[PDB]
């Protein structure tokens, strides 16, 4: 007489287990003989999922227990287990038996792909986020333990375990410190993803972290650079230079912030090349502070400049002088005058030309141009190198004749723009000039003689308008009252000046009545160019 | 009749629990009547640590255990327990109780201090030794229970310890990852200190760990250092300028690594003076590149150098130029000749000085010191800002007679060093001179008559040692058979040389043979400085 000893039995069985686990003992004795008590479920879709013993009673698996195998209709499984006999005792017990399925991890966890790519910065903050690694879970949802997990393993790689973990809960890889590596160096980051439930299954991952590419800081083939100095003549398209700077596997781009407020220079973006954008003269400034900048190509992508200081140089642009303006004249009309007895090699005026703007110069090459002259004889010459006009030729008999050429004016020794003056030269005699006798030394002339010519030009030039005075020759005392020799050491200052109104002689009692009607302001006015002396005794026609 | 059940119980003891926790059940029956059995242990060591319920039978602690208070003769620790009853009913039974005793934690772990210091490298490598933290045992060695276990805890402090790992044996605190954090930041390290053993005592410390202090780049004050022109007169002492850079709180030590070959400079190493070292001249090199290097006070204690790229700076020292060298004369006797009739501001010479290594001036003034001279007259004067040579009076009647004077040269308008030099002005009249017959223009002669002059002097020097040729004056062709005027397109050229050897005038008929001897060769030789022209066709006494 099989009987049970008890008629419900509630087991909540772990589902997903490797076959070969027993669980529960379900008991039924026999009243009159044996222990061979054999034991037949009424259920055909467990027989495959569970093996009953039907000699002990023990309850093993044939193949792991599957949810999704049993109807989706019942939250609780109940079946029924019949008891018999080898030779059938009766009465025959009924009993019922409730399976309660564990609702935990059916599947293992699958990534969505094997390899993962990222990027991190050298000096990346707290939470920097780098890439999003999430895996399917293979699970009916609806309970914590079809959540995965994500933690770092340091037990192979230390090295990426320690320095980047992933969060917990969204799988975001943030960086947990502040990294200092060098580049181009490829990690690998295993990340292990697992539920929160009864035996954990588990698989592996592979997370490819390269950190950049390098060429951040530009390095100068120079840090201050100076190009050979332009021509003030140059125009929109001369190039002056070209800057450069190497950097790893980038490209750089160039740009200009400061130096070129005038707007005089531009610069290539992709090669560097420095241009004249607008032309430069010696009226602007002569010396430039430009200052340029030099990028990476992943700081210009990403909107960024580079945060160094060997990212600035100088360049220094200096202008030489060239040809650029005429020579000027100090006057239009070079007065001056010359003896009938005067030989060769004679001083007779010093013509001086000036640059307006340009000081390239040493000195000037003067030619002139002559009209004929009477008797087969040839005009005057000029020294090249100096402008000293010299006397050509004896002037004999010639009464108030003047002599008038021109004199051309190119700076450096001849080449190019050239200028025009008007040169007068009057012939003079006795019947001309006038003696004036100082009592002053010879000594106290000689060195000052164009400053005392200047003074007698501006006494001369105050009664008639118009007048250049040349000192024709200075002598000792001679010229007295019977035209004998007095006193060695006093002087008779020979002063002729010229009209320009008639490029003709002045009378000599013209200037006589001049210089005599002043003589109480002209012995005052004498006064700074002394030296030491006395004054002014008396004026004596020659 | 109580009896016991089992005459021999073995229970490992826990020690050090708190009180309260029950372990063992001794249990005696009396057969007659009765479960009211007491129990009584015949040991008054235990009955301070052990309480036992004489009714129930449990086991509980009144004190913790301590393996100290047994002796430490046994390591098996057995006593008796008796069993009475309130009426008193025999048999009495008597069994044995043996108490074995864990070993493990005795007291919890104490640090040696609470407070420990450190320091770390901004770039510090992986395994940098910091500091050594180290708490003591407090309990009785000989098992794996006694030894102390670190382990760093990010729930308050993620910052410190997901940087910093200490070692787990040795205690020694390494840097787990690469740092890179910014300075005079304290962070707080919480290490617990914790034992391998049942119920884990533990507690907790602070490690304080500051980085280090700043001021490891140095701060130019400028990049490129330009002092003022030192003078090539200085002396070992001139202080030329300083050089200065900045550092957050740290003392800056500089040293000259290059630019110095010659040892010119030195430099202080506690400022930043840079005097002279030796005297710099202007023989030498003007311009220096000095690289001045700045350290900061920690490299140096260390024994390091920065590793930087602005730590460079580049001194650029001109030299200005002075008067350091007297002038020297291109002759130390200048030779030349006047005619007796020759009027004031007529050309006799020019006086040429030049500085031997002196670069600085642009005119220098002349002075004369005179013998006395007869009937009160007064010698030559020199022009100041030129160095020409005047003629001062008229000499007429004096044959063969030289007037030698000294002419002073002092740079720059006159301050300093002095030279001194001799010239020989000779008085020549018509029967010392000779006049030569040309078949050239007047245009040929006049520009280059100094090149004439040295061709000419070349001539005389031949045929007498030593002779200065002098050109007295130029004119046209008036010297011929008759003295009478035939062309106007030729020249006489009148030649006059002086003998040195006796400092006075040359016959004419001996130049007349000098020049007259050697024909052939003189029309030859009188080729380059022509422009055009003929020959030479006679030369003719005047
Ligand atoms: C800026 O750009 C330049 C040029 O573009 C880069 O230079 C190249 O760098 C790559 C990467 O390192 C080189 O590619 C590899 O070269 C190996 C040759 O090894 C040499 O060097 C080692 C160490 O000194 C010697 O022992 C050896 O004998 C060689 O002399 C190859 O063996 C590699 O092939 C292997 O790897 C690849 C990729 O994994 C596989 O597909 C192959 O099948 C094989 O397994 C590889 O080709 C390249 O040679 C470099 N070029 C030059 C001209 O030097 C710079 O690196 C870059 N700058 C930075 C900072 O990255
Ligand atoms: C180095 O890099 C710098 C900065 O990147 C460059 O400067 C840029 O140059 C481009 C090319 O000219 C500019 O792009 C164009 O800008 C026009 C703006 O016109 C201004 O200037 C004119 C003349 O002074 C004024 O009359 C006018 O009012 C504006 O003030 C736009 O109108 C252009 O758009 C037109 O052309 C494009 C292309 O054909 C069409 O698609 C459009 O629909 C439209 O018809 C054009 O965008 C740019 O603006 C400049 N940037 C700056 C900041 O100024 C340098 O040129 C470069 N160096 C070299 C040598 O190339
Ligand atoms: C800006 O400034 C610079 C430098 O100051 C000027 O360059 C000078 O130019 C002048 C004029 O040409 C030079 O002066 C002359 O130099 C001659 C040297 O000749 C050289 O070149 C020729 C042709 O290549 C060669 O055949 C020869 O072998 C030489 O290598 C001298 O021979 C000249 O002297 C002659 O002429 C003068 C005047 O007529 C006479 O008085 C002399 O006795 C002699 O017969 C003359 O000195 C000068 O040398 C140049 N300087 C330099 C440093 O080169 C630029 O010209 C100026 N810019 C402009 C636009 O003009
Ligand atoms: C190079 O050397 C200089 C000078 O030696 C240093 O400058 C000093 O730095 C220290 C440390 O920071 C300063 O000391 C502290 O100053 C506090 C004043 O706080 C001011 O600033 C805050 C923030 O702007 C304002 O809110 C506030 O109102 C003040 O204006 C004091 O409050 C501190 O006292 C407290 O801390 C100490 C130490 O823990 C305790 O003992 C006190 O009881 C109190 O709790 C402290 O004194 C100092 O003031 C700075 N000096 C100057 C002149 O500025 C540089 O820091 C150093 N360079 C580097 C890189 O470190
Ligand atoms: C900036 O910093 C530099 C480097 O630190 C300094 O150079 C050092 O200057 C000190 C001070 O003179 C030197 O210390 C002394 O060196 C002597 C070596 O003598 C040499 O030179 C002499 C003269 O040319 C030779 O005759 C001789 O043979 C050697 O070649 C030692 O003899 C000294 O020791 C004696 O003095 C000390 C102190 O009194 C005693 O304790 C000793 O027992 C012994 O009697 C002394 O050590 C040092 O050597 C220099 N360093 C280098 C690398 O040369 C600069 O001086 C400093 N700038 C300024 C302005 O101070
Ligand atoms: C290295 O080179 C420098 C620059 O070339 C020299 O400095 C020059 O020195 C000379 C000589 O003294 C100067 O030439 C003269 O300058 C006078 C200007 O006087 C100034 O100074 C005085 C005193 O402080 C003031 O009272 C006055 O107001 C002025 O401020 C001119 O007046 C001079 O001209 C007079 O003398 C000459 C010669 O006799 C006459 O021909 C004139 O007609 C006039 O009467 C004279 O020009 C020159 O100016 C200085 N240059 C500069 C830029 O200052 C250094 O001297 C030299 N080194 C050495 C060691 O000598």
């Known amino acids: 007489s099989p009987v049970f000893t008890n008629s419900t039995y509630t087991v909540v069985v772990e589902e997903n287990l490797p076959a070969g686990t027993s669980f529960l003992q379900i008991e039924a004795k026999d009243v009159d003989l044996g222990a061979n008590v054999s034991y037949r479920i009424r259920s055909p879709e467990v027989k495959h999922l569970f093996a009953l013993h039907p000699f002990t009673g023990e309850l093993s698996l044939l193949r792991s227990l599957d949810y999704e195998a049993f109807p989706d209709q019942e939250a609780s499984i109940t079946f029924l287990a019949e008891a018999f006999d080898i030779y059938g005792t009766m009465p025959p017990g009924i009993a019922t038996v409730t399976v309660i399925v564990k609702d935990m991890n059916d599947y293992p966890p699958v990534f969505s792909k094997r390899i993962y790519k990222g990027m991190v910065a050298p000096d990346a903050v707290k939470g920097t986020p780098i890439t999003t690694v999430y895996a399917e879970d293979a699970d009916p949802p609806g309970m914590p333990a079809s959540r995965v997990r994500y933690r770092v393993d340091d037990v192979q790689f230390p090295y990426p375990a320690s320095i980047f973990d992933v969060e917990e809960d969204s799988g975001r890889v943030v960086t947990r410190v502040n990294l200092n590596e060098e580049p181009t160096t490829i990690f690998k980051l295993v990340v292990v993803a697992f539920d929160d439930g009864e035996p954990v299954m588990s698989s592996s991952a592979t997370v490819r972290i390269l950190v950049l590419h390098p060429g951040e800081i530009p390095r100068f083939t120079q840090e201050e650079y100076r190009p050979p100095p332009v021509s003030e003549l140059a125009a929109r398209g001369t190039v002056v230079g070209v800057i450069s700077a190497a950097a790893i596997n980038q490209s750089i781009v160039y740009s200009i912030v400061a130096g070129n407020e005038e707007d005089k220079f531009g610069i290539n973006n992709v ?9 430069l003269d010696y009226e602007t400034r002569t010396s430039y502070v430009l200052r340029v ?4 190509l992943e700081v210009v992508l990403a909107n960024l400049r580079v945060p160094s200081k060997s990212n600035t140089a100088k360049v220094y642009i200096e202008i ?9 004249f100090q006057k239009k009309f070079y007065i001056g005058g010359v003896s009938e007895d005067a030989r060769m090699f004679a001083s007779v005026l010093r013509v001086k030309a000036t640059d307006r703007d340009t000081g390239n110069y040493s000195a000037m090459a003067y030619r002139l141009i002559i009209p004929p002259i009477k008797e087969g004889k040839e005009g005057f010459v ?10 050509a030729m004896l002037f004999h008999n010639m009464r108030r004749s003047y002599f008038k050429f021109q004199v051309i004016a190119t700076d450096d020794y001849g080449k190019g723009l050239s200028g025009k003056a008007d040169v007068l030269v009057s012939v003079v005699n006795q019947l001309d000039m006038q003696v004036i006798v100082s009592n002053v030394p010879p000594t106290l002339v000689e060195k000052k003689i164009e400053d005392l010519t200047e003074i007698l030009d501006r006494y001369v030039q105050e009664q008639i ?4 005075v040349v000192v024709e020759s200075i002598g000792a005392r001679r010229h007295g009252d019977a035209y004998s020799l007095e006193d060695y050491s006093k002087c008779d200052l020979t002063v002729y000046a010229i ?29 700074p160019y ?13």
Chains 1, 2 share one sequence.
Do not use: C, M, W
Request: aromatic content about 8%; charged content about 30%.
């Open 530 to 542: 002394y030296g030491e002396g006395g004054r002014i005794l008396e004026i004596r026609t020659p």
């Open 382 to 391: 000029v020294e090249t190198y100096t402008g000293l006009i010299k006397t």
């Open 271 to 279: 090669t560097g090349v420095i241009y004249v954008n607008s032309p």
């Open 293 to 296: 900048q030099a990028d990476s």
């Open 465 to 468: 308008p118009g007048a250049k």
């Open 499 to 527: 009209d320009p109104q008639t490029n003709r002689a002045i009378d000599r009692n013209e200037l006589f009545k001049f210089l005599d009607g002043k003589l109480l302001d002209i012995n005052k006015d004498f006064q």
């Open 320 to 328: 030489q002088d060239e040809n650029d303006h005429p020579p000027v």
